[PDB]
């Protein structure tokens, strides 16, 4: 309801945040490369 | 074995580590910018 | 509705993902430094 389902909801929310950070790591990685060959 | 309070505690712990990694991404982003602009 | 073993399993999987991201942040950090003190 509002407790074990709360845990499950929050874990999914954190998975999304994980995924957003992987995408941001990749953006920053491309920014470093442009600096590197520029 | 499966302690629900333990699960909730560990989810909160991982949320704080998420938060710290966001701040570290931000630190690295500014360092990249320092090298882009100089 | 919620499978508690599954929740524990997924929390540990997300923990491993966090640990890998920490290591990836560190790799990118070294790359930036390489550009910086070059
Ligand atoms: Na920033
Ligand atoms: Na930002
Ligand atoms: Na920002
Ligand atoms: Na710039
Ligand atoms: Na070290
Ligand atoms: Zn622990
Ligand atoms: Zn099951
Ligand atoms: Zn899984
Ligand atoms: Zn460092």
Residue numbers in the entry:
A (entry chain C), B (entry chain B), C (entry chain A): 1 to 38
Sentences from the paper on this structure:
A genetically unrelated functional amyloid protein system (Fap) is found in many β-, δ-, and γ-proteobacteria and in pathogenic strains and is thought to function as a virulence enhancing factor. Full-length FapF possesses a large N-terminal periplasmic region comprising the first 70-amino-acid residues. In vivo secretion assays have demonstrated that this periplasmic domain is essential for secretion by regulating the release of the helical plug.
Crystals were only observed to form in two zinc acetate containing conditions over 3–5 days of which only one was of suitable diffraction quality [JSCG + 0.2 M zinc acetate dihydrate, 0.1 M sodium cacodylate (pH 6.5), 10% v/v 2-propanol]. We therefore subsequently processed the diffraction data in P1 to model the six chains in the asymmetric unit individually and the structure could be refined using REFMAC5 and PHENIX with a final Rfree of 24%. As the 1H–1H NOESY spectra clearly show three tyrosine residues in distinct conformations that are not exchanging on the NMR timescale, we were able to confidently model the core of the coiled coil with a single buried Tyr20 side chain per trimer. This leads to an asymmetric arrangement of two surface-exposed tyrosine residues within the trimer and the configuration allows the buried Tyr20 side chain to coordinate with a Gln23 side chain of an adjacent chain. Despite the asymmetry of the central tyrosine residues, the conformation of the backbone for the three peptide chains is symmetric, as the number of backbone amides peaks observed in the 1H–15N heteronuclear single quantum coherence spectroscopy (HSQC) NMR spectrum is consistent that expected for single peptide chain. Another striking feature of FapFCC is the presence of the buried polar Gln23 residues, which are stabilized by neighboring Gln24 residues through an extended hydrogen bonded network across the core of the protein. It is worth noting that much of the surface is polar as expected; however, the central portion of the protein displays a surface hydrophobic pocket that could represent a key binding site.
